[PDB]
Nucleic acid binder design. Structure first.
Ligand SMILES: [Mg+2]
Ligand SMILES: [Mg+2]
Ligand SMILES: [Mg+2]
Ligand SMILES: [Mg+2]
Ligand SMILES: [Mg+2]
Ligand SMILES: [Mg+2]
Ligand SMILES: [Mg+2]
Ligand SMILES: [Mg+2]
Ligand SMILES: [Mg+2]
Ligand SMILES: [Mg+2]
Ligand SMILES: [Mg+2]
Ligand SMILES: [Mg+2]
Ligand SMILES: [Mg+2]
Ligand SMILES: [Mg+2]
Ligand SMILES: [Mg+2]
Lengths: 123, 129, 146
RNA sequence: AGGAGGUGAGGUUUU
RNA sequence: GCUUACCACUUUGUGAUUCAUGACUGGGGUGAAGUCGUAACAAGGUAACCGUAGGGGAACCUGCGGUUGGAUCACCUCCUU
RNA sequence: CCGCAGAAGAAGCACCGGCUAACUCCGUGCCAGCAGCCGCGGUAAUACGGAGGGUGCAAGCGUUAAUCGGAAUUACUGGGCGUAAAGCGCACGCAGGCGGUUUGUUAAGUCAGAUGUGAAAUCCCCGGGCUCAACCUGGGAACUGCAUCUGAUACUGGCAAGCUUGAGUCUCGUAGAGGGGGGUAGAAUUCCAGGUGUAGCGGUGAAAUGCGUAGAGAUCUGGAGGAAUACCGGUGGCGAAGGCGGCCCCCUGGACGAAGACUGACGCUCAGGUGCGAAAGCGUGGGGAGCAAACAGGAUUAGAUACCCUGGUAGUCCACGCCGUAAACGAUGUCGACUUGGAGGUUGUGCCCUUGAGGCGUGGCUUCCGGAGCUAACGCGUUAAGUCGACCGCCUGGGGAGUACGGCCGCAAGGUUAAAACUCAAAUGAAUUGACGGGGGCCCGCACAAGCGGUGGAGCAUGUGGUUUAAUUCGAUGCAACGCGA
RNA sequence: AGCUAGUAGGUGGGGUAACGGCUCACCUAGGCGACGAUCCCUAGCUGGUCUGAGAGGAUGACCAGCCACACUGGAACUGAGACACGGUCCAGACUCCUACGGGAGGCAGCAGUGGGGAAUAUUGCACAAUGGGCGCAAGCCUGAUGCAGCCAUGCCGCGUGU
C-alpha cells in the first residue's frame, strides 16, 4: 500500500480466463461430433441430458449440450457450437445451434422458432 | 523517527479536540507559527503563544462554540512520503468553500481563497474544516 | 448388469421375472452390444398387458441423421395373462409400481427385466413451499412505492 | 480463593 | 578471362529451448454413497492442532518440542476471598 | 415535380415466477423438458410442450463472440493484514526511501507571466445545406502535453555555517535462570558386591505377559555410573527471537537508574545480503541411570497395528559440523508524538515530622479491569486493534497447492521461490435461538434402588407377518400397530 | 543476472552527398547493467475509437501521418531521389511451356478462383468532375478516383393507413 512499494513494483491486474477457451474470441465454431450420447445429470435435476463430444478445427475436443425435445444429431455430423454453460451438467460449457447443415428444428414446436431453427409456417 | 513536525502538530491538535483540552503545547518553529497564524486568521483556534528562548514552546488554545469542537476534520495533505502541488486555479476547495485548504505559496503561507486572489500556487499543507 | 442405480438407491427392487419385448429393426442391434438408456423406466398401465414405457432408445450412431431411430415408438411387454388387472390393482391400492431394471440376453432376445418397485415418498418440501410463498408475498407487498 | 484432595473412562461406531 | 577478401543458401559434427508422441507409472478433482474403519465437530468418548522422526490397508497411531484456536474445576477434607 | 385505378402493393421477433414489462387453460407427471442466477417441473406447472390472451422493441428482434462499467473485485483519487485471504521466526546492515532546530546563499523540484508548438482529421460549442435528420461543412474553444526567456524563495532539495531537543561516549551504582568454559554438593533411580530374610513381587477398572526358594521383592553396609537440580520459584526477572533454573570461579555481552561533561542530526526503516535460530533428524568419537519411536510379549474388542501392562533400540547426554523447518503467537512488523482512567507485581531515585515497616511522588519492565474512540462483533483500549507520520513485507473466492516443474542450498531426510490445467458457487469469520454432549450444577419420576405377583417353558382363544387359494376384502405398523377399526 | 570485445574511446588513412568504428592499422581496457543490462515471448506506432463523471481499462475497425514489406533470402547497377510494388543478377521451393536444342512466373493492385473460417463483394462504366504523370498545345492513359452491383453489416427517415 506504500507509495514506494507501488513505485518499486506497480500494482498489477489479475488475469481472467474466458469461459469458452476453445472458441478463441470467435462467435461460433464448426466441428463434427466424435460421439453423441446421454449423460447422467447432477443431484436436483435428475432429468436426462443429451451431449456430444466433438473435435473442432482447432484440434480440441469439447462436449456440447443439445437443447430442445428430440435431437436431430448423430455422429459424423457437421455441427455448430455457439457457447454457453449449463450449471446442471458437470464439465459442460457449450451449446449446439440446431439447424446448421445437419440438424432440424424441434418437431411439433410452434414457439421460439428463431431460437430453435424452425421457420415461421404459412398457416 | 520524527519525520514530519506538521503532521505531529495536526495530530496533537486533533487529540486535544477529542479530549476537550483547552491548550496544547509542543516545540515551535517558523513553519509551525506560520500555520498557527493562517489558522487564527480564519479563527479555527483561540490564540497561539510561543514562549522560551533556549527551547521554543508553542501552545495553542482551542475554540469551543459549544460542546461540539469548532474544528471537526483536519487532514495532512503534503506528507513526506508524497508531496502535493497544484496549479494557480486548480487548488482544492474543501466543502465547497467551507473550511480552508492551507497552502504555502511563493509569497508564503496562505489559504486557498488567498492563493486564488493572489494568482499563484504552492504546496497544500493540510485540509481543515 | 444394468442395475438401474436410481431404482437401487431408491425403493429397492422386490419382484421380477424374465421376458423379452417386441421392437423393430431400427431400435435393435445395439441392445446386443449393450448400449441403452433404461434408467427409471416409467412403465404404466396399457391395455396390451402394460406396454413398455419410459425407457428411450440408445443414442448410438445408427441414426439416419434425421432422428436417432424413434423419438417415441411403441414397446410391448410380454405376459400371457397374469398382471394386467392385478397390476392395475397393485398400482391403485398397494404402492408397488413396476419399472424396467435391466436388459439381459439369451444371446438373441433383449430381455425386459422389469421389477415391481415400491412407490417411495417425496422429500419434505414444507420449507421450500413456505420460501416460495414468502417470495411471492415480497413481490406483492411492493405496492406502497412511488 | 492461596495452597494440592480426589474420583470416572477396555462397557456403543454407524444410519 | 584468372584470382584474393566479404558474405547469402546448403552440408557436416556437437550443443540449448519448445511442441507432439511414447510401453508403463504417480498424484489430484468430480460422480455413486458401492465396499471397509470411525479420525475430527461435545471432555467426539485417547483434546486436538503446529513442527519433526518412525509404523500401519488407510482415516491415522506412537516418540520429542510448542499453542489454546480445550473442560470440570475444586464427587470429599482446608484456609484465604 | 406533375398526372394515374384502388388501401388497393408492403410486419416480424423476443418475453410474460423475482431480478424486469407482461396471466389463464389443456397434457405430460424429477419424466419430457426451460434457464444468466435464484431456481422449476414427484397430479393439479401463470416457470415444461401447446393454445388463448398481455408486455417490450419494431424491418428489424433474440443467442453467441470481445472491452469497460456496475467490481471500491489490484482501489494513485479509492481496500486490508488479531480471529474471513494477509506482519517475514528473530536480529544486523548496504544500495534505496524519508528525515529534528536556526541563518545565509544557489534556483534544482515547485509557482507565476510570455513565446512557439500540440498536423489535418475526430469529440464539443455557435451556425449553415441536403424535405428535418443520418451526413457534410464554416468559425471558435479544447487537445490538460512539450521546450525556451524572465521573476517568486514559503516548502522539499544542492552548498556553506550553527544548536541540543534526537541520537552515542564517559563518571557511579542497581537488578537479572543473559552467553560460554572449568570445578563442585546432595536427594533420587539403576546396577554390582556383602548381611538379615521368606513365597511371593510387579501390575490393572479386571487379568496376564514379566521376575522369583538359584534366595526375588523388603530391609541395613560399601561401591560404580548417567541425566536433571526438590523448596526458595512467582500472570517474577533477563535476552532480538528461540530460550535461560543447585553452588563457586574465570572471560564477557546487554538493560535501567543519578545529574554532570563531551560530539552535534552523526538519525529511522529496509529488497538483495549476513548471523542467530525450540524440538526432531543426519555425520564423526565417546556415554547411557531413567524415559521410550520402531519392535516383542500379555490384555481389551467382532477385529486393534493404539489409549491398559512388562520389556525394549534409535534418541534424549557430551564435543565439532549439517539441517533452518514450529500454534517459531501477543495469530497484533520496526521507530517517533498525543489522548480520560481505576487497581496491581518488581527495580532505581529524590523526598517527608525517615515520629515506624510508613508519607509526597517520580522514572525502567510487566498484569488485569475499564472511558472516549475503533472494529462485523468478539474484543484493543497509554504496552491500543484510537489519533497520525517514516519504511519494509504480505493479501485479491475455495480446492487443486505451499503441489509439480525450474533455480539455489543440504550427505540425506528435505528447505526456499513458485504455477497452470481443471472443478465448485460457494468457502469463511463474529454473534443469536433451538437441539445435542458417554459435559457440569440443581430438582422430580413403579423410573432407579427394596419388596410382591406376571410373559418367554404347557394347553386354549384373538389379531398380525410369511405361505396358499377364488378372495384369505381393506385400513394401522416402536413407545403412539397387533382381544386395534370390528 | 551478467553481456560485449569492432565492443568504449583516442591517434591517422579510406569510405559516405555529411557526422560517426561505417571500415582499416595501432594504442588505451573500458562501455552497458538492479532506474532491469543480456536473453525469451508478444507486438506495427501515433492522431484517434470504445467504455467510463473523473483518474483509469481495452484496442488501433473507416480515414490521415510515419515505418517496414512485395514467393523466401542475398547483392549490386541506373537514376538527384531504391537496394526498386507491375527494373536487373543469383541460391531454394513451387508451377508452367518445350521441338527436350532449352525458356517464363511471382495478385500482401483492381477484380476474380482453389483452401481456411462464425463469417464478408462484381472478372462492371468512365476519364464526366478532381487529382497523377507526359507533352508548345489539342491531346494519352490512370483498377487513384467518381459512379454503378450484392449484403439490413451499422446509423437515420418514411410507409403498412385515418
Ligand atoms: Mg472419535
Ligand atoms: Mg468504473
Ligand atoms: Mg476497477
Ligand atoms: Mg478488502
Ligand atoms: Mg488467517
Ligand atoms: Mg512476529
Ligand atoms: Mg512459516
Ligand atoms: Mg522402559
Ligand atoms: Mg506468522
Ligand atoms: Mg481491557
Ligand atoms: Mg483461486
Ligand atoms: Mg515443495
Ligand atoms: Mg577517421
Ligand atoms: Mg505479429
Ligand atoms: Mg503483380
Amino acid at each position: 500500500a506504500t507509495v514506494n512499494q507501488l513505485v518499486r513494483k506497480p500494482r498489477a491486474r489479475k488475469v481472467a480466463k474466458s469461459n469458452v477457451p476453445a472458441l478463441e474470441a470467435c462467435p461460433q465454431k464448426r466441428g463434427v461430433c466424435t460421439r453423441v450420447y446421454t449423460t447422467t445429470p447432477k443431484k436436483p435435476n435428475s432429468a436426462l441430458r443429451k451431449v456430444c463430444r466433438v473435435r473442432l478445427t482447432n484440434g480440441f475436443e469439447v462436449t456440447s449440450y443439445i437443447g430442445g425435445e428430440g435431437h436431430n444429431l448423430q455422429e459424423h455430423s457437421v455441427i455448430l457450437i455457439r457457447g454457453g454453460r449449463v450449471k446442471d451438467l458437470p464439465g459442460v460449457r457449450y451449446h449446439t445451434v440446431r439447424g446448421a447443415l445437419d440438424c432440424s428444428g424441434v418437431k411439433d414446436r410452434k414457439q421460439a422458432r428463431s431460437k430453435y431453427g424452425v421457420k415461421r409456417p404459412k398457416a | 523517527s520524527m519525520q514530519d513536525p506538521i503532521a505531529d502538530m495536526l495530530t496533537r491538535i486533533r487529540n486535544g479536540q477529542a479530549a476537550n483540552k483547552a491548550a496544547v503545547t509542543m516545540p515551535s518553529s517558523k513553519l509551525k507559527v506560520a500555520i498557527a497564524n493562517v489558522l487564527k486568521e480564519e479563527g479555527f483556534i483561540e490564540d497561539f503563544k510561543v514562549e522560551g528562548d533556549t527551547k521554543p514552546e508553542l501552545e495553542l488554545t482551542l475554540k469551543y462554540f459549544q460542546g461540539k469542537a469548532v474544528v471537526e476534520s483536519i487532514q495532512r495533505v503534503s506528507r513526506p512520503g508524497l508531496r502535493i502541488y497544484k496549479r494557480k486555479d486548480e487548488l482544492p476547495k474543501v466543502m465547497a468553500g467551507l473550511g480552508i485548504a492551507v497552502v504555502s505559496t511563493s509569497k508564503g503561507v496562505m489559504t486557498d481563497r488567498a492563493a486564488r486572489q493572489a494568482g499563484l500556487g504552492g504546496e497544500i499543507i493540510c485540509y481543515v474544516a | 448388469i444394468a442395475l438401474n442405480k436410481r431404482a437401487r438407491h431408491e425403493y429397492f427392487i422386490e419382484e421380477e421375472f424374465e421376458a423379452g419385448l417386441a421392437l423393430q429393426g431400427w431400435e435393435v442391434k445395439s441392445l446386443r452390444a449393450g448400449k441403452a438408456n433404461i434408467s427409471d423406466s416409467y412403465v404404466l398401465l396399457r391395455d396390451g398387458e402394460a406396454f413398455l414405457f419410459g425407457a428411450n432408445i440408445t443414442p448410438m450412431a445408427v441414426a439416419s441423421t434425421h432422428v436417432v431411430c424413434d423419438p417415441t415408438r411403441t414397446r410391448k411387454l410380454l405376459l400371457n395373462q397374469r398382471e394386467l388387472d392385478s397390476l392395475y390393482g397393485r398400482v391403485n391400492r398397494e404402492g408397488y409400481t413396476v419399472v424396467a431394471l435391466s436388459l439381459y440376453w439369451k444371446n438373441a432376445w433383449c430381455k425386459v427385466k422389469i421389477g415391481v418397485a415400491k412407490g417411495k415418498k417425496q422429500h419434505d418440501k414444507r420449507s421450500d413451499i413456505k420460501e416460495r410463498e414468502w417470495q411471492v408475498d415480497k413481490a406483492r407487498i411492493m405496492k406502497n412505492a412511488h
